[model samples]
Target chain A: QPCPCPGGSSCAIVPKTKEVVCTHCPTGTAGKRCELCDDGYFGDPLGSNGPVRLCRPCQCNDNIDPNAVGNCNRLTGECLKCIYNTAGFYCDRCKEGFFGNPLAPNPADKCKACACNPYGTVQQQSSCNPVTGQCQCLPHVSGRDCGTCDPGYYNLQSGQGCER
Target chain B: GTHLLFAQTGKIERLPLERNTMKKTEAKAFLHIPAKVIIGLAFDCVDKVVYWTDISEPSIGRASLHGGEPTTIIRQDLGSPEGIALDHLGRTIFWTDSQLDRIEVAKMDGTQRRVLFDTGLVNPRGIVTDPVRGNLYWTDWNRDNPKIETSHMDGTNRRILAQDNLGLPNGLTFDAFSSQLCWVDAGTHRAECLNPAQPGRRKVLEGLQYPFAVTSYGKNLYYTDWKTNSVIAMDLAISKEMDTFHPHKQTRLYGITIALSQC
Candidate 1:
């Protein structure tokens, strides 16, 4: 009720409650906050539902199946292979210090370092014959065969192993 | 006595008993004897002849590297000797007899014999010398507990250089160029190496079926595989590269010796 006055206004403050009452909407939905829309319907506002329709996964290349966490852009119909270096059906890459050519048609030996060339050089061949398991090196060159240096230049140490 | 010899690739050779002529000739084995097996073979390239032994037969024989005599080094019942390594010093012959379980050293004429080492070994197989060390290293085929033993030329300072994980431990040789040692681990089908000081173990070769013997010639390492019937070569000049070329079939070639003219 409002009192009749030349320029009068009335205001009321409501108290908060623990038990909330559900708001009336369609048969498929009912909530105090109306957080969900009806089945197959998208709600733009909290309670107002848009057209009831199902959303389909976006289409992409045939080779890769997108990961569960990697949802396709529903609006753009674009699914990408996970980026190189990453694995999973998508192209997520490996972390640094870790390497592998996982996508090779035939899985390779994974990625491993060559025998530490008796010297200290980075890039070297990885695999070799079963009998020797030695990467081919030159006659005078040693270190897993050709990967390192001569005894005089490198080190004259022997045993099952040696220190750098 | 001159004798005839056959090679892996059907090449034969004949040699005169008195001296080496430095020539190779071919001959075909007319009589094929299956009962007799060639267990041990050592060639003196200087002498141009091959010394052989048959484990099943009662005598040791010699033939030309090319092919001649196929007869006895000396006609004697040696109780089944398996390995033969010659010490060029003083014309002494060293060989192993399984039943005796001892390495015996004798003159080239098979006389004035002495036991190099006999410590109740299960079975001693393979023997070689360290020219620099002037010591003899041999294998003890103790089946479950195989070891590599070393002793002096006079059979003193007996010691076990290596033990454990040595399968059969067949033929052994000291690689002078690398100043290292090599031996066949028969049970494991591998060839392993160790330092002259008996430190470090590197398997130089593997996947071989019953590798029986090993010898170094020039810059190559040669060995025989009984099961695969193949002779393997690892180019020690290029230590990392191993080539399994020159496979010989039929005969089980047990021993190998190579000669390079130091002169």
Candidate 2:
């Protein structure tokens, strides 16, 4: 007689002990019959039996701390840690002022500060431009960093000011 | 990376930007209008609707974002309508007709349609609405006098915002966040902007071989270049080329609009 096994695993008999065993659970799953996934792995509620089926790694990018466990939705790739103005299924970008690419291979560049110059003659109107680090200039001031006064206004050397 | 909506021939398509791939994925056709040409596209984010102009049908049309049968908003008395915009706060739609040399507006459902400005314009190519300030801006590509102008939403308090150093100002838009007005000039082969009340003018990008229809999102401005048959995205502050996408050899990429949240 053959041992009954679920789809995710196959039954095998131990050579020495002659005991039935199940093997090949997905990455996060481990059981006699590969029934459950490991803490960080998740995919397919009822893990598939097909040869191609396997529990998937959370694949959380630098947006979440390394060594942190299971930040993604169990079934979908949507990142559970996508919060605090962070968006996208993979948490690849910060909303604004927050810079750098979370999806980048180099962790050093993940979620860095935009750091737009506030003292550069003109102050940013609101959140910095998300794509190019550019921000809107205040009244009578213009330039990438608000470094210059408008044509009509003269830059006064004192107190870093401009006068119309 | 934001999604883009544009028109070619008689069809409208939505192209998604693949952030990982940094390339435009294959576009899916959103609507197939029974017209010879679709010139401009605009979106009302508040209402979640897409509006476009039909040059051949000489009409303006609207369809829901989910895609379905489109309804003709203005089919009569329109002469080669080229540009379209939605005033979300005012609950109206505005557009420019090249042949008739006028800018007009109507209720969301197309009723109460009336001409707003008609006397001074020779050929009005592009139009945009500023819901934040309640105004209309347009580009006049007159051979003798090319410039950008603005007026009250209901055709009052007309003012010439810019007239000198313009080269066939074809497409116009207002940057609400920056409080600046931008446009593309086919004759000058450049894109530029200036504060409506300020005297200084700035060129955002220049030396383009051919350009048309311009719009801004975030800190960048996007425009269509006829010479390369592609769309170009440039950083407004630094004037650096960020990305480009050319869909087809025969496709003349014209009017463009960006819906950042819709991406």
Candidate 3:
């Protein structure tokens, strides 16, 4: 048995296998022998959607999907850049010092660690916007995220004071 | 999921020489399956065979360099066996069991199974024996699970060596040529070195990903990429760790064992 192509291109035939190996579609086109999305990709070309969808890696600002050997965020339409102070894909979380609203503006590339003084009540990474000079206080420390110890405590919160 | 197989680097092929000669072809295709995840592999000069353990299996297996039948040489039903070493005479095999949190050993045939030390063994994975003094060196992953301990062969003179962000130290090797200890962080994917006798140790290689297993062979170093199912090699003389060859590509490679022989 056989079928005709619209343009009348030559086609091969099988002896007794009764299997059809259509040769009408172009190289990357799929119908018989040309049946696949090339190496490292997938999707149909002749059907709905659009042209053949080639493999696109995620625009994951971080190395979250290191082995993404297939369809990626850009291809699937979930691309995004990491918000400041927060790292990883989709702005999953904030870094050390920064907390509260993850969608806050002026989001830096990496999280600024809170100001942390060991001797003081507060102890954590110290961080603040350089332009604003806002001192990010660490845990237990106040005045931002509670970075420095009280005056009497000797900035122990910043890891600068003597062990009381 | 499936049986894991490991072997010494640049050594035996898994089967025996006679089998290959009888067939009149190169002796390959040895059916060696490592029972579990492996961390380290070593060779006993006396036994003339290669030995390796499946740290996760809690069991150990061995094979002849020339290949024959691979068999389980040790079975403790313990937990996550990692790191391996031989006694001065190469009669006993020493290893660590992270799950039970202990260091253990047994005769080559797996007889006389015993624990060298217990308690205080947080995720203990990599182990080594001092070739010059017969002392032992070991590392632990003490992260959320903190532990780093050392003891004598008889399990005496115990002490916690160090406990910081070692990041799940998995594979360990002593560079006799440089007199330094080299370790790979399973969690951090970094290779590090330290003068054990010295007070300070440093991170030398960084940015390595998932370097779970490590070994030193023929002036070179090798590590395993578990996810990729490949063994990576590095020239210690040059300090560049590269993917030498995917042993499994040429053959099916798994486990974490390496042995060496002239033939």
Give the winner by TM-score.
2
- Write model 1 residue lDDT over B1-263, tens digit each, in one string: 33323222111212221232212222223222233445555555455655655553455666654435465665464665666766665566677776556788877667887877666675676777653456788887765578887777778888888887776788788866677778877687777777757455564666657777777654556677656655566654345435543321132344555533321
Ranking by TM-score: 2, 3, 1
Ranking by lDDT: 2, 3, 1
Chain B TM-score of candidate 3 stands at 0.75
Q: What is the per-residue lDDT of model 3 for residues B208-229, given as tens digits with 9 covering 90 to 100?
A: 6666667664455666664544
lDDT of 2 by residue, A1-164 (tens): 55545544556776795645453333354333444343345555354543434567666564653212235654455665443346577786775566555565665555555554464434434456565555555556656556577788875333244566
- DockQ, 0 to 1 scale, candidate 1: 0.00
Supply DockQ values for each candidate: 0.00, 0.01, 0.02
True contacts kept of each: 0.00, 0.00, 0.00
**What's chain A's TM-score in each predicted model?**
0.23, 0.55, 0.32
Name model 1 segments beyond 4 Å from true. A1-164, B1-35, B64-71, B75-77, B131-133, B201-203, B236-242, B245-251, B259-263
Instruction: Quote the RMSD, in angstroms, for model 2.
Output: 24.5
Q: How close is every model to the real structure, measured as TM-score?
A: 0.50, 0.59, 0.51
- Say which prediction, candidate 1 or candidate 3, comes out ahead on lDDT: 3
TM-score of candidate 3 on Cα atoms, chains taken together: 0.51
